[PDB]
């Protein structure tokens, strides 16, 4: 249920050190050589809470890139649901 797309040939190579304030929220091509890195961690993509007070699970969401927050109150007259994400039924997306 998802395909994200590629963009191949964007014809203005800024090497480095030409990044300035104006290029933010733009589309930039850069060359370089890869230094150290980290492992592969999972990041959450669909979240399913469950209110401990009013029984059962709530339902999926799509959040975020990148906020990861903070769904408060519903389905039990908006109270008093201190929530907790469960480790089951939430699809993760890997990160590096």
């Amino acid at each position: 249920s998802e395909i994200h797309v590629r963009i191949s040939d964007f014809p203005t190579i800024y090497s480095l050190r030409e990044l300035r304030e104006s290029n933010l929220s733009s589309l930039v091509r850069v060359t370089g050589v890869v230094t150290r890195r980290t492992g592969v961690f999972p990041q959450l993509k669909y979240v399913k809470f469950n209110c401990l007070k009013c029984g059962s699970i709530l339902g999926p969401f799509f959040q975020d890139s990148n906020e990861e927050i903070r769904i408060s109150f519903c389905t039990n007259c908006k109270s008093k649901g201190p929530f907790r994400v469960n480790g089951e039924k939430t699809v993760y997306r890997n990160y590096q």
Binding site: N50, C54, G55, S56, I57, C74, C77, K78
Partner: protein, 284 residues
């Protein structure tokens, strides 16, 4: 199907009042006569119509006569919508009341049962202890403060509060009101309380009260100590004090065989027959 039923009766109604309504010759009571009632309403700007039942009893050979008379409460907005499109065809803020009259058979209070719910009926009795005149909302402007609060909405039916879905923007279900006490469209209604005729009661018991609500045109037309004829629609009002009657009275414990786990918002309901009327004629 059912929308094809109600829309089908709607187009048959538009087709009804657009056509001829007077059968009489030059010695009359000339044609049409409905368009004289619309235009005669347009000159004075009073926003009601008085239509008869007998003319609708003439035309369809009783087929449509047996379609409004039973499920009348189902057929308000289709009827009022079709009449509004006739008005926008033949005329240039509008609140329309469609008050029937001149029904065949008059019933008393004793002939009230509960199989006759929804329908039309002619009730005759005696007015005693009328009340005063107070407004009523029926046109909401109520949405949440974060952020948009400009939603015109429901509570035409008595709830009253509040708007439920498509909220707010952006505070979702069930964020709702604060309401607004300056952006609405009101009308006024009183609650007279009829008492049974003296020349009718079965020997021997006591007279029997009934409640009745008047909206819109028929405010103030009643008179303390006079006989009346009313108009049928006969709604049901929620009642409280009939507990320990004895029962067994039902209850409405909601279902939980859906949602899968990892409170008790059950309710009671007990109902008494009131009456709702819109045309008051004082012959008696």
């Amino acid at each position: 199907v059912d929308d094809v039923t109600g829309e089908k009766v709607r187009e048959a109604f538009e087709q009804f009042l657009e056509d001829f309504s007077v059968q009489s010759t030059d010695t009359g009571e000339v044609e049409k006569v409905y368009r004289a009632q619309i235009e005669f309403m347009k000159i004075y700007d009073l926003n009601t119509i008085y239509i008869d039942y007998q003319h609708l009893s003439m035309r369809e050979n009783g087929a449509l006569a047996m379609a409004i008379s039973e499920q009348y409460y189902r057929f308000l907005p289709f009827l009022q919508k079709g009449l509004r499109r006739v008005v926008r065809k033949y005329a240039p803020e509008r609140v329309f009341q469609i008050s029937f009259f001149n029904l065949p058979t008059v019933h008393r209070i004793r002939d009230i049962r509960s199989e006759k719910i929804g329908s039309l009926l002619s009730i005759s009795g005696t007015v005693t202890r009328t009340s005063e005149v107070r407004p009523e909302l029926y046109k909401a402007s109520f949405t949440c403060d974060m952020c948009r609060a400009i939603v015109d909405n429901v509570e035409q039916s008595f709830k009253y509060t509040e708007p439920t879905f498509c909220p707010n923007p952006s505070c979702e279900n069930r964020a709702f009101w604060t309401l607004n006490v300056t952006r609405s469209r009101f009308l006024d209604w009183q609650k007279v309380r009829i008492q049974e005729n003296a020349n009718e009661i079965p020997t021997g018991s006591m007279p029997r009260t009934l409640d009745v609500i008047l909206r819109g045109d028929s405010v103030e037309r009643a008179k303390p100590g006079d006989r009346c004829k009313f108009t049928g629609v006969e709604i049901v009002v929620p009642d409280v004090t009939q507990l320990g009657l004895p029962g067994v009275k039902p209850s409405s414990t909601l279902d939980t065989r859906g949602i899968s786990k990892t409170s008790l918002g059950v309710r009671d309901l007990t109902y008494k027959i009131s009456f709702l009327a819109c045309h008051v004629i004082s012959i008696g």
